[PDB]
Amino acid sequence: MEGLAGYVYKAASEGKVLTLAALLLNRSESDIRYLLGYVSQQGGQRSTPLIIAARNGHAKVVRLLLEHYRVQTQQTGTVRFDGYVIDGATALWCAAGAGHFEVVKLLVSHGANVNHTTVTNSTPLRAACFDGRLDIVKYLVENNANISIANKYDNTCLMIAAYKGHTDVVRYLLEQRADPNAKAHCGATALHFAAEAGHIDIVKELIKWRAAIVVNGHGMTPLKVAAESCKADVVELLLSHADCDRRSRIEALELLGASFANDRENYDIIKTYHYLYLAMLERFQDGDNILEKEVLPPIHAYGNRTECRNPQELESIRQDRDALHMEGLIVRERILGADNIDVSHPIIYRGAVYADNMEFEQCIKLWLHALHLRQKGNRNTHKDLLRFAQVFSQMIHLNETVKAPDIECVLRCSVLEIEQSMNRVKNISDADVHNAMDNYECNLYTFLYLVCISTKTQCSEEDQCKINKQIYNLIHLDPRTREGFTLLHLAVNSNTPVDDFHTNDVCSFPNALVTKLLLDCGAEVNAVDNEGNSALHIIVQYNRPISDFLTLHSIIISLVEAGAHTDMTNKQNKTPLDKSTTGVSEILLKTQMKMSLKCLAARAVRANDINYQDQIPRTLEEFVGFH
């Protein structure tokens, strides 16, 4: 009976308009709610045959399902639309999202919820407007469906339609008395989105319908947002707003030059110099009432430049491209502020360019500044820490010296970010717990990469003391991954993931130096994972005893000297000698096994399975617990 409905679900994507008749003629009746109400998942999309027909663009299958009968179509589900998954979708929502006007009109005429908000409180109108067409939204707004309905993040139809280059859609929206000054949860008011994608006609139509300029939540005017994303025509239009004053105009021009300095999609240096020079000239337009630049004190990351308060000094840095890169970074920092979200991206890109040109020291300085700015904003910076690990590994691989204070700074940042990662993991229950655990695991991996790099970098007594202080601080929180792996277990484990980039040239696990440093920094040597293995079980399960026998011997000596039992069992009640899976490792461990009557007695008790609960001392109770 299940296969009969599964074949109909499979044929819903196909065409069997006059073929599926044999399955239903002289069929039963009590299975209607399971055949028509078949809610299956073809790959993980909670849907019906009608829903997948609308999503794929089969109005003929909808008419098939409404040939001589009728099916209820308004159902919740998580449909994986082209690009991404959406939870709480429905038939009308999916028909609108795929740009099928006829299917949408068929669903409306047959009866569908025009306001069927998803789990993310998303209306079908904005779902259509993501790929909006005029003809598909005509009847949708003529079905008395309110366009002023908010969203999970208050992204209304107008905001997304202005962001996605849908001038016809925004025209039909504002011509029907929509909300001009709508406020999103992030604070943007449908002009920042219109100026984010550089749509000149959309901004033209919004200013035509009296959109007006108001600062968003992040302390940026729409003009400054337009100048942030390297767009020019919308900046010219917004400067032609006729109510813009002058201070905002010069700071917008400087920001436009700054954005043109560092962005891959729009990179010009002549445009940067010309925009900054226009800012300088229009700044000193009168002589008296000269708009002297207030300049923040020089920051060591961008060299030691101090902007340019004069036309002569802007002329002096005309031909020097890297000087103009630093100048653009500095004016962007001054205008956008250090608390902006999209101020660290050009710093990261400039550090990347300097890394590609084999100038690592300035790359390290710029990336440290970007990491500090991103950490003060309390954002997901695991990608940045992985980038730090990659650039340090490339510095080591070219036999280039790595400055110890840089490693200390990035280690402090990684420790702090792992602290907030633990806080986020504890706070998040099930919304994005998988994403939080992935970020936590990759952050632990980045910290171990940084530790492995720090082992191979020459440091003084003070520098090594500070690095060991950071390592000691991170040990005393006892970070753990999904399968209970402590920070020692990951450095011990050969199965610890290594980034496919240049970290492969430096950080290879198991690494003896990392384990020696961690044990010398006070790691819990007897710690266990969810599987119950200690560090010793993981290191004896190493499948390569001859290729890096020196590494294996050093790490086994370190773990034994640190005081781990050579006898403790895992959850599967296996002594690591029984889990050595290697003659060489077994011989080494049996050489390092210190004989003791205590372990022999405890193992005898465990083997005979004598009832020891509430008979022996509690510490010895635990002792026989793991022996």
Binding site: H192, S229, D342, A355, R387
Partner: peptide, 23 residues
């Protein structure tokens, strides 16, 4: 193509718009 040191983020830019149909 994240392998090059060029930033994995496109331009970020998802600060003010939470991208619809993306999660």
């Amino acid at each position: 193509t994240k392998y090059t040191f060029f930033p994995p983020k496109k331009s970020h830019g998802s600060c003010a718009p939470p991208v619809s149909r993306a999660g």
